[PDB]
Amino acid sequence: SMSVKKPKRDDSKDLALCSMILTEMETHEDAWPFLLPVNLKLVPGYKKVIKKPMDFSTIREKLSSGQYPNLETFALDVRLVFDNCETFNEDDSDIGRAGHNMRKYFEKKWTDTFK
After folding, report:
1. Are 96 and 34 in contact (CB under 8 A)?
2. Closest to 33 measured CA to CA, from 25, 44, 41
3. CA distances from 20 to 14, 58, 76, 109 (A)
4. Any idea what the CATH number is for the domain that residue 17 is in?
5. Contacts with 25 (C-beta within 8 Å, 6 or more apart), sequence order
6. In degrees rounded to 5, what are phi and psi of residue 40?
7. Cα separation of 31 and 49, whole Å?
8. End-to-end alpha-carbon separation of the chain, Å?
9. Closest residue by Cα to residue 102 from 4, 30, 13, 45
10. Are 15 and 63 in contact (CB under 8 A)?
């Protein structure tokens, strides 16, 4: 509360560490469905169904331009990528399996780096 604070966590490396995680996601062999925005002209149903499209290149641009105020907002966009994937793709599809794999990969890096 006012004049009552928990000890100050060192957040000075968060930006660099989120960048490294994102690099590792970008270079994973199953990242291909997620590297670029879904083409909303060419993919029927996507625009109407997926209220907040997100992809790795968009996260990268937001990260590089100071549009994440903290590491929670960064994780929310990463997860949004996989939540969108699940909304639109059958579990038993290449993209569906890609999403589950990348989410797992992300969550481990996230826990190991920050928890």
Report:
1. no
2. 25
3. 10, 16, 17, 10
4. 1.20.920.10
5. 31, 34, 56, 78, 102, 105, 106
6. -70, -15
7. 22
8. 24
9. 30
10. yes
Resolution, Å (one decimal): 1.9
Residues 6+ apart with CB under 8 A from 36: 55, 56, 57
Q: Write down the H helix ranges in the chain.
A: 14-26, 46-49, 56-64, 71-88, 94-114
Burial (CB < 10 A; 0-12, 13-18, 19+), residue 3, is exposed
Experimental method: X-ray
Phi, then psi, of 62 in degrees rounded to 5:
-65, -40
- State how many domains the chain has: 1
Tokens of 73: 């907002």
d(CA 95, CA 90): 8
Kindly give, in sequence order, each residue whose CB lies less than 8 Å from that of residue 67, ignoring residues fewer than 6 positions away. Answer: none
Domain residue limits at 69:
1-115
